[PDB]
Amino acid sequence: NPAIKRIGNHITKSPEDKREYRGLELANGIKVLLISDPTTDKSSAALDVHIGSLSDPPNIAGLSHFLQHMLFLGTKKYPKENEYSQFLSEHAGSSNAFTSGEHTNYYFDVSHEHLEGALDRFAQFFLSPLFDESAKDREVNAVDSEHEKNVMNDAWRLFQLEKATGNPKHPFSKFGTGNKYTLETRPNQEGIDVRQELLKFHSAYYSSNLMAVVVLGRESLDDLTNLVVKLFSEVENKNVPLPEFPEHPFQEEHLKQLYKIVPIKDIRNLYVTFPIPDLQKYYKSNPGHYLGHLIGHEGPGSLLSELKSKGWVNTLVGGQKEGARGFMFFIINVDLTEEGLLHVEDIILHMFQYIQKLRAEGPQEWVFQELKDLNAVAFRFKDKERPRGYTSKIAGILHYYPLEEVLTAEYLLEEFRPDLIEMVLDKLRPENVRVAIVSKSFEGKTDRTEEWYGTQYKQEAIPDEVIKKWQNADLNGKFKLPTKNEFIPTNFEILPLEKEATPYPALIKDTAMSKLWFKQDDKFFLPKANLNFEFFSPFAYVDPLHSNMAYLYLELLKDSLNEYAYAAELAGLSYDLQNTIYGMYLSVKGYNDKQPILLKKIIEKMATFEIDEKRFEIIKEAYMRSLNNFRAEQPHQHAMYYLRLLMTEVAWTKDELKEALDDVTLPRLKAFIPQLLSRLHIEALLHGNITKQAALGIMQMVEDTLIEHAHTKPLLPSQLVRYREVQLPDRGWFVYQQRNEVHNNSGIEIYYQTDMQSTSENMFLELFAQIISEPAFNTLRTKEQLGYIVFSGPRRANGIQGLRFIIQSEKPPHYLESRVEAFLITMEKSIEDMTEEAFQKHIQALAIRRLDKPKKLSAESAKYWGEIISQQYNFDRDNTEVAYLKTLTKEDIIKFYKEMLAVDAPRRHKVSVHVLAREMNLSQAPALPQPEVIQNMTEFKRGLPLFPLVKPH
Amino acid sequence: NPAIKRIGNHITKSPEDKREYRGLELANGIKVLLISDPTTDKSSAALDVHIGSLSDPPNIAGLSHFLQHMLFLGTKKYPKENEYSQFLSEHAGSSNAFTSGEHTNYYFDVSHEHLEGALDRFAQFFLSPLFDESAKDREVNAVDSEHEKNVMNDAWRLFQLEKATGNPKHPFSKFGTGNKYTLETRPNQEGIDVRQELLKFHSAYYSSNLMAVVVLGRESLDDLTNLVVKLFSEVENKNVPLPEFPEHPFQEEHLKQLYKIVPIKDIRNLYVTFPIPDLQKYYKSNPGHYLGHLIGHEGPGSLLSELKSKGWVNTLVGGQKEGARGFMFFIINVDLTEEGLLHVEDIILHMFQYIQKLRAEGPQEWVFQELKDLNAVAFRFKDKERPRGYTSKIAGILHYYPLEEVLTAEYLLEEFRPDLIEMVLDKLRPENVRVAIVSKSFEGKTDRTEEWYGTQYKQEAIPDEVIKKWQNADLNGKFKLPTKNEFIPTNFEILPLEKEATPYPALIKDTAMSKLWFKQDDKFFLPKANLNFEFFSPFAYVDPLHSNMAYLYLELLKDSLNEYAYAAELAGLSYDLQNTIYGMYLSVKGYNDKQPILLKKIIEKMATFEIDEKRFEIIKEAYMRSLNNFRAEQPHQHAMYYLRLLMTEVAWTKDELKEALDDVTLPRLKAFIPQLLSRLHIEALLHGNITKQAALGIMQMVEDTLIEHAHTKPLLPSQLVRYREVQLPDRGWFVYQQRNEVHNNSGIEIYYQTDMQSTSENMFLELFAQIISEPAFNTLRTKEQLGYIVFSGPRRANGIQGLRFIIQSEKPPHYLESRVEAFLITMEKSIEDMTEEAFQKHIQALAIRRLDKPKKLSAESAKYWGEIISQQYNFDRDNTEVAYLKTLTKEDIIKFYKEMLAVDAPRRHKVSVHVLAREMNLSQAPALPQPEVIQNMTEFKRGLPLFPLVKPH
């Protein structure tokens, strides 16, 4: 075969991975991985191009990002603007893309029987895009919206600020995302045809070298091979030299700098950065990882431990940070306490003291050994990935590793390289450093402004005597290297499947204190378990005060055993502990071998907890800011939040919690804990590599610890209350209005309440949602360009359901309402006009979606956990509901729409949340009734019935 | 309701379709569609019975066909033989029926007011047919006559020859029409009684489970439902199983066969046939339509293109052909060049080469998607069909599609199935082929004759060595898939109706070169336009040589323009270009979006045309043949032809044209075109979704591009002569006599010239025509059985008019002549004794007929285009004429009759054309004068005056 330059030799894989693999290089230079999985419900492909933002013309910022958006909007072979989304939607598929500095990456998935149909329209993106003049004009608004979204985000401003602070001559300084000014306004002044610039960039850069493609489907490796050469062999090779950036954007005048930055949120952060060369070629030894593991450690003797005891820092992340081909960073970033802010200089000294300890001790082979062994274990027993993310990730890394190593490359490490470790370590020095402090105490004290986000900052040379001081950092005896990690699992035997083994979780314990659901794993066979525990107490949410305490208690508890839990987390054994509106949730995930030890330590510490006063005072302050910082979340997030508050029987607002926070007192918390724990009920799902007796033992141990240390007794059955959704009246419409003080966009959520969850009502909503799914996106975004964020879909809460719309835009909420209303009429009409096939396609699509099998334990566990926490206990819901769905008729969906959804529906139940921006041809919209505006959340709830609660099976 | 088994309310229809639909399944098994159109002037109904000639008793060919004729002739509820035809005639209605292999379809229309009366008389066809004994003896001759007109027609002989060459045991071999021998002579000899047989067949097969019914009217869906049930639920259900023909009439020994066949006309054709399975069940992917689209394609890279370039072929038809439940055909038919005839083996090689190309590429999804989307817009913007044809057609398809899917079913493709396409393509192989060659060069070299038509042929096995060469057909670089079609309409915006917009076309330009009529569509609102142009030049018809050249010129233009325009018409944009007696004629119709492009290209090529010598010689020999092939046209067609020749001032006969054809020469033609183009007037009608300024813009383009490329200057007003009619003398009778050399049947035209067209003279003539219409058919055909073809009505040429009778018959024309004379006398009494109420019935019937409103844009255009080409411009004609009609009395019509038409009218002007056959109680006929016998057409024209020409209203 002439279309193929070579066929790689094995692909090395996990011995647990039953998927089959072939690597290739096409004649035109495209690198390909083929994944055959005869099991898979969905198929996918990804194509990564080794070109991104850094290659934008200095002329037209964000052109690569704009091009990425445009490829979806039409091709020569498939010229319909939305041919691609629509095809995917009707065959159970999804798509997305992102562009970074050096890559632009495109992925989709689809029902396994439509790989080729999908792949054909996909390939066309890279052969002959239209860049339609009219689509270009509309879509420019979508990216402007991406950018608006981002302007008031601290992560994004910091991201761009770093760039605007190194060498301006350097591609690194570029604005990646782009906007209206950048992509339309500017280029129109200056007289640029942008459709031609899009066409030019595509031809210049979308070359077949520089491209890597990955395809996963049920077809054989041979069938997959033939499919790929036919579709991709005809992408033109233009031999484009791969861009390189040998010179660091941080030159000498950029080092030894201090930036003082004012954030949007009330946060207190310190960023420490060292320029380093590109360590990527050293992937087999990975010096940066070794140094990241150490600087980053959180166990006894670590940097964070001491910085925490001094009460300066709560949180630390350090390690290798990516740059581009030719440059990298090493970072040590930290959050700050009120004290910590006044001791930055000391903090950085402690940082250099730890680095000195590393130099003094020399590189440690046993540490490398441990890192290497963990990775080997992680690679073996790795969970099966969802096809979509898997093809996207492999497409990216196909540009860095030989075909044969793509799967292992960034897991397995082989070489101990003291010289490299020591070379990188030699760049982590006080000369050669950059410091950034993010605090609101810099309001008014700044002299500089960032062009693209508006970030306000000041810039100073770090005084030579300060550098000198850090250079003379001596050994601090509080800093020790970590100990042998004792949580490393050593037992991976999969216990045989029991005789009494069951396809779904079984109630194996039903006492007054405990309800234990159990299932031994019958499909994945990795040595892992998930242990889920819901703890009920009326005292966790009784009032705003108690809610606060429940939160602090668990934050304080997690903080206290962080040092101990860190070791376990590196050993692939983690936990999750958070308060809920019913009490607490605890989940332990990972290798089953040492789970009992971790769990026991957690429960022992729960029932025995001794609050340190200093930790209490610090965490309280952080929580105060956390509550305040909601003021700064996105308008669409506000809308969702207000609806939740508005539709739930009891729910405490953030202003309520905040007010109550001052009354939270150390004595009072010491009192709350034993009260919380005196009466509970525990419902649990134990699922994975465990036997019934092990499971029963685990439950009992949890119970027995709690009884022994906290004198826990059972809760009455009538105390196990669940909350209800408010019942909206036939033909009613309520509007709640609020202002977002930070963002210059509006948010809206529209909720059409339908009825209680039930097989029939579930599928009516679900199928209608499916039919309008891509049309909503296509109408409200692609055509009308209302905002970047446009969502429709089902809403499920408290056993009740409905249809929702969520939009964020610069257009007012009253206007958004009318456009969604206009859209609903267009939908009734198109359901009428569509053929019985079109209808039957959407049924089949919803079917494939609902019946998609879990690929990993956690995914299965989540399904079951959903059944348990909602008390519906419907483990076979998918077969039942899908069976019933195929029964449905184009006729059934129209009466449902007319009964519940249409503007003049007898049983329409509308509520809207309008969240105003911070300072406030197309189809025909219907006339709307005058809404009743909600003045007061409590009164609104008081004046309406509450729904029943859904019945168990 | 117990009379209705199932009721489905949805029929998926087009978004623009204003009519309303309800599907039904009756208790007796009848599938029903009702169409409610409150606006129609004509209601209609149809019934399709799923039984045809393929179910005829082996010993009585043509029974089903015969039975179809008989059902018109009387019923129990209505025993008067012509009650049905008369009723429809007196209420502006018309009826007809056809019999096919597995279908018998009956349909009528009538004044919307009289649906129930007509439907009732119609329902009876299916309850209590008389099958009158004496009616049966007469109507056999009608059938025999129908077969007789077919005997010498090449298409029918071929049709039956295919049947004669497959399995004789298969019901496919049956002769479907029947004749005197079949349905009378053989059965009497064999002892059969056919009335009994008609009755057995009717009762055995005319069962309700085998019937579909369609009713269209103004009445609501609910009234229509009651009406159909009242009249059709009483049809007995005999629970008849549907015939099934799973075995193919072509078996292994009927393949690899070659047939050499002698035509009647001088025609050279090649028929290639592949037997295939019934593909009907795959209607939603339509594999045969996909493969037909490609093999049948005419654009660059197609099979046709290569074949045409070798100078072997002119036209090509490809694709699937129906057979019956259980079997189908795939065909590739081509006409032949003198060279082509010598190169049949190579032509077929190329066919298989093209098929090979498709195998090697595999199913092309973009092609299918393109077809899908074209159908989607085709269906969206389809013209409103005439009720009669619409009911009939739908009645047919209700047998194949669920009630809800009928309107869309023959229109919308749904899923692309590459696997079926490959299943069908796999049948298109040399081992599976039949080949037929039709040419005069087999005259006297054949040894077989076909029973029913007498077709002369020879049959040979195709040598295995020839088969084996076709199997090895390799790839040919001349063949490619089509290009993406760039005529696909994109823009369907219906422009707002202008302030200065007129009900009728307005004269918006009046240059010495251009007279432009314009009207913006004010009633249909579809994104289409009709662009009509007449170009006047004296040089188009100055002499036979110049007629010939004008013809050849436009034929050659279209030939060269074909590759370009094929894609255009695939996309609902087409044109029509032909020489007229005056100058020439161009029409561009379809979606208006790309009309200017095509139109401009046509006028450009027109004015810039450079002839291909090979193309010239080929089209010339085809035109030579076509010219003398008129020898083989029907006697009644000869009749009409000579009348035209005799009655019009200047007219070239085909003998004159054929003779002058030899002097047409490449240089002479090259010289003719600029001479033709140099001086022109242009009259145009631009009607549709178009704007006054845009119309002006279109004319301008047309003129500009003529002026720029052909130096076209205006004609003089006195040059713009239209032709006049010969003026017959009072009491004169002339007979022109000729014989048909091919058909053993005679034809006749009788013309009673009255006077110049004028409101009164038009309405006298067309009211009399109305009154005598039905009686003429009943008397001369149904009663007297003179022949299958019996016609009467108005005749309009060159502004003059009169009454015509056309008859084709076994009888001599001198006899035919007295019988229409006899008829005219008994029409005199019939009107004399006609009741005053009956008279208004006819007046009302004419009224509704003339005042009936257009349903398509093109129907409206044609009505205006009529007024323009005839230079009358009476755009509100029907109102003024119908208003005058109502003034008319019995006395007035009688007065018009004895003065103009009666045997002894002082102003009777009679011409008779008698076409003799190849080899040549009752009301009494009147004594006739000796006619003057026309020896010479020129002598006759010269001895008579010429009428004036009509004044432009």
Ligand SMILES: [Zn+2]
């Ligand atoms: Zn984006």
Ligand SMILES: [Zn+2]
């Ligand atoms: Zn017939």
